[PDB]
Design a protein around this ligand. Structure first.
Ligand code: A1ANS
Length: 169
């Protein structure tokens, strides 16, 4: 079965959300696209990026290093398409702004705009966690920007409940 997402709550006609680990979702659903919360040099050193790379037994990092050698780094708000390995057909590496490192929160709209080149995506909440953006604001930018079908996996029941309550106000 293709893009077999289960147990999501539909927020809008094209945005769905689940309290789930994106790694486990990717292994079970086998989506056409999984989004990585990347940095500009595609160094998957921790957080969501480190977990997705570890689930590929480091194949994503080796492929990423070869992409950067030939193409140079990404820009904040930009993306590239690489292999999905065992997690998806493709991985869309998207760089959201890291507010904790002084990058502009306005680039979060440009980051979500990359999703619109793909019909269906499994994604994390961009710039949340240690990237420092307000997660309620990241969900609002996602809903306002993405026009294709996005399935957000947020691996924290406390944050999931706060996001659904924020959306339903
Ligand atoms: C890394 N540990 S894990 O168990 O594999 C995992 C964490 C995680 C996860 N965590 C959320 C999250 C969302 C975005 C970003 C991060 C974190 S970050 O801190 O890695 C910086 C990059 C942007 C968190 C808010 C609840 N969301 C979805 N599947 C996940 N899987």
């Amino acid at each position: 079965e293709v893009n077999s997402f289960s147990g999501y709550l539909k927020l809008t006609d094209n945005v769905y959300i689940k309290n789930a680990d994106i790694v486990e979702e990717a292994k079970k659903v086998k989506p056409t696209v999984v989004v990585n919360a990347a940095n500009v040099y595609l160094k998957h050193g921790g957080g969501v990026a480190g977990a997705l790379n570890k689930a590929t037994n480091n194949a994503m990092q080796v492929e990423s290093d070869d992409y950067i050698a030939t193409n140079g780094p990404l820009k904040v708000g930009g993306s590239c398409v690489l292999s999905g390995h065992n997690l998806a057909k493709h991985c869309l590496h998207v760089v959201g702004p890291n507010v904790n490192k002084g990058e502009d929160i306005q680039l979060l709209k440009s980051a979500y705009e990359n999703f619109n080149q793909h019909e269906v995506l499994l994604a994390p909440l961009l710039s949340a966690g240690i990237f420092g953006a307000d997660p309620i604001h990241s969900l609002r930018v996602c809903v306002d920007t993405v026009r294709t079908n996005v399935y957000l996996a947020v691996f924290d029941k406390n944050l999931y409940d706060k996001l659904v309550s924020s959306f339903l106000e």
